[PDB]
């Protein structure tokens, strides 16, 4: 089997189903997310699951 | 109607407590020519040797008083996932009635 | 099973024929007479009696075998049938019962 904890992240259709496409203007995006931020759980799960979709798109 | 919890709380064993270092009266149900088995209480009977004094005074229905160590002899050894049992109980007698 | 009665009646008829041919009344007759007649009419140099010719009664010839131990349908008759050694175990049960009864009383 695949080794990642959520191999659907590494799958290709997961990257393609991403529903976001940035404008040609934005060149760089920076993220700052704490590890144990109980409010930052959303940020951490985003950085874990979604950024691959963004970078692929 | 009375709950089994109530019957156990008022049971003779819950008030008995630890079986060790406690006297109890009992009687025998089977007896071989050399030894006698007392049914005293709880689950198991206790096997005992016939004493040298008053040898013949041991028949069915005799009420003998005696102490006991535990109501079940068990022990767990190095390779015993379940502790070995004896199906009996150790006891020492010093009187009758 | 009917072969047993067949052999019995045929053996009785053969015994009557034997008495007739030897020449005595069939009213009184014995198995020592049977064996003497067989030894005389059919001698044999065979040494073992089991091999020598013998006209014996079928009850003693055939070894008794247990009849059907259960009825035509359903349960068996004896109460140890579902184990072997039923007769032995029933006898031992009766023996132990007698032992404990005598106990409570007291080649």
């Amino acid at each position: 089997p695949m080794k990642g904890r959520f191999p659907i992240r590494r799958t290709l259709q997961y990257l393609s189903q991403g529903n976001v496409v940035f404008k040609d203007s934005v060149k760089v995006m920076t993220v700052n997310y704490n590890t144990h931020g109980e409010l930052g759980e959303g940020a951490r799960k985003f950085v874990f699951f979604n950024i691959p979709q963004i970078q692929y798109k | 109607v009375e709950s089994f919890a109530s019957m156990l709380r008022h049971s003779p064993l819950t008030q008995m407590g630890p079986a060790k270092d406690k006297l109890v009266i009992g009687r025998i149900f089977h007896i071989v020519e050399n030894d006698l088995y007392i049914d005293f209480g709880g689950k198991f009977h206790c096997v005992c040797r016939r004493p040298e004094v008053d040898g013949e005074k041991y028949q069915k229905g005799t009420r003998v008083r005696l102490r006991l160590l535990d109501l079940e002899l068990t022990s767990r050894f190095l390779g015993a996932t379940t502790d070995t049992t004896v199906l009996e109980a150790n006891a020492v007698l010093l009187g009758i009635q | 099973e009917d072969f047993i009665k067949k052999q019995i009646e045929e053996f009785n008829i053969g015994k009557r024929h034997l008495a007739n041919m030897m020449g005595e009344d069939p009213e009184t007759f014995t198995q020592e007479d049977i064996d003497r007649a067989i030894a005389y009419l059919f001698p044999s140099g065979l040494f073992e009696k089991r091999a020598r010719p013998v006209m014996k009664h079928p009850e003693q010839i055939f070894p008794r075998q247990r009849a059907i131990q259960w009825g035509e349908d359903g349960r068996p008759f004896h109460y140890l049938f579902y184990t072997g050694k039923q007769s032995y175990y029933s006898l031992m049960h009766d023996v132990y019962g007698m032992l404990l009864n005598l106990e409570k009383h007291q080649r």
Partner: protein
């Protein structure tokens, strides 16, 4: 025929689905009665797995506030003179009467455990029961 493999599942499942397949000529005797009066737990084979770590058991021991006083009485005045009779149900005993007195005194007067214990001792001495351990 009948299926001899029992680790698969329950006898009922096997008999039922074999009758459905049409292998057996007709059901056995116990089938209908089992279907009518099923048990609380379906009989299925499962292998026993020893425990490891902190998975000791859902079971816990049995103790009581009055068991505390039973312990304290067995410790202070132990080996009661009377011989316990386990045949008789609801058999009254020295320790049982003593725990009854303790409880009634403590939930009537609402005093300190040690002094109500001492006065329970005084009360049973007035009653005249022997106090030798």
């Amino acid at each position: 025929a009948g299926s001899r493999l029992e680790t698969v599942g329950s006898i009922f499942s096997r008999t039922r689905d074999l009758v459905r397949a049409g292998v057996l000529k007709e059901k056995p005797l116990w089938f209908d009665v089992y279907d009518a009066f099923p048990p609380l737990r379906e009989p299925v084979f499962q292998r026993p797995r020893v425990r490891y770590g902190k998975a000791k058991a859902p079971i816990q021991d049995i103790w009581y506030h009055e068991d505390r006083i039973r312990a304290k009485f067995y410790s202070v005045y132990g080996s009661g003179q009377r011989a316990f009779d386990l045949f008789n149900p609801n058999f009254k005993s020295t320790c049982q009467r003593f725990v009854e007195k303790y409880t009634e005194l403590q939930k009537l007067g609402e005093t300190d455990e040690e002094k109500l214990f001492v006065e329970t001792g005084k009360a049973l001495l007035a009653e005249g029961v022997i106090l030798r351990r």
